Structure 1
Amino acid sequence: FREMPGGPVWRKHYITYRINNYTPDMNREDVDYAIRKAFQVWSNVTPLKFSKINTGMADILVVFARGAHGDFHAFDGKGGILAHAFGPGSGIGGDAHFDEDEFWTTHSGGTNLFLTAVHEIGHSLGLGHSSDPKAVMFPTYKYVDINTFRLSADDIRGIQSLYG
């Protein structure tokens, strides 16, 4: 089901993001590069353009939080929930929230922020889910060598059914 049901999308190509706060698990420039490369995975395959901003309102807020954090999607200590997105739209729409009890990383150990951000930014773009274990929008993350990363064909089918 590779697209949001009914499906909200962005009605413009120039999209913005803001990092609300940073995780203490990582270097600041590695949180930056994880989110920058996670947006690049999706701009490679659509008309969309993604820009970081440092004050005011953004289309997509990136947030680190733990436990209850102001929507009906409360986090839950180490393990269990590691993140949640919201679909395209105003205010809380588009926003990607990540759990701070988890240990965020650049690498194969811990919790790989780039790979998680590809799925939850994928929902911030209006993706559904694939039913194939090879897909990034599948209901299962697998660790894959981030240095050689590719979308699956069913993820490219999904995002190209919403944009272009």
Structure 2
Amino acid sequence: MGPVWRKHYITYRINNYTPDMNREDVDYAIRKAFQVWSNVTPLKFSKINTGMADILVVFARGAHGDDHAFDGKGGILAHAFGPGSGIGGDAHFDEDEFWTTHSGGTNLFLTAVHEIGHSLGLGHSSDPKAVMFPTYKYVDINTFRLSADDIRGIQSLYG
């Protein structure tokens, strides 16, 4: 195994908000993305408005304080660090993308599900049906499901 959180109670905080979307829509996309993983694990996620949080959610562009600069519009969409202190767990979204609640631009909810998978310790899948397969493609949000591979992976880490 790579690194895993050593507690099942995990906190998150949204550092800043993309101007591409309404604030309320960012909050909702992120909450629902955490819920996807909560639904198949003993993990419980709790939002912090101010102070220390395990998973910091950040929107930033270009070089933004870690060794992994974003690349402007297109290409890399986002990245996340595996479980750990400090930057460990943190999920970064490239502001040079256009984040949306729908099929236009790049869907924030779906991308966050993939990134939070990384924040929890998952690597990439070779199952094209898995959210951890490293190709972004819009599927509608109401019918989105984790694949059996995603579930096998996350349950192998927690529970």
Query: TM-score, with normalisation over the residues of structure 1?
Result: 0.95
**In structure 2, what is the Cα distance between the partners aligned to 1:155 and 1:45?**
10
Deviations 1:80-125 (A, max 9, x none): 1111100001000000000111100001111100000001110000
Deviations 1:17-69 (A, max 9, x none): 00000000000000000000000000000110001111111000000000100
**In structure 2, what is the Cα distance between the partners aligned to 1:114 and 1:162?**
23
Unaligned runs of 5+ in 1: 1-6
| Residue in structure 2 matched with residue 20 of structure 1 by the alignment | 15
**1:128 Cα shift?**
1.6
**In structure 1, what is the Cα distance between the partners aligned to 2:42 and 2:66?**
31
SS in 1 for 2:142: helix
Greater Cα shift, 130-139 or 111-120: 130-139
**1:77 Cα shift?**
1.1
Alpha-carbon RMSD across the aligned residues, in angstroms, is 0.7
| Residue in structure 2 matched with residue 104 of structure 1 by the alignment | 99
**In structure 2, what is the Cα distance between the partners aligned to 1:56 and 1:24?**
23
1:118 to 95, 113, 116: 113
**In structure 1, what is the Cα distance between the partners aligned to 2:134 and 2:71?**
19
Residue identity over aligned pairs, in percent, reads 99
Unaligned runs of 5+ in 2: none
SS in 2 for 1:67: coil
**In structure 1, what is the Cα distance between the partners aligned to 2:142 and 2:95?**
25
- Is residue 69 of structure 2 the alignment partner of residue 38 of structure 1? no
2:64 to 65, 69, 76: 69
**In structure 2, what is the Cα distance between the partners aligned to 1:97 and 1:155?**
21
**1:142 Cα shift?**
1.8
SS in 1 for 2:130: coil
Which aligned segments of 4 or more residues in structure 1 are displaced greater than 6 angstroms? Answer: none
- Is residue 143 of structure 2 the alignment partner of residue 148 of structure 1? yes
Aligned length: 158
**In structure 2, what is the Cα distance between the partners aligned to 1:133 and 1:150?**
13
**1:141 Cα shift?**
2.0
Greater Cα shift, 103-112 or 138-147: 138-147
Query: TM-score, with normalisation over the residues of structure 2?
Result: 0.97
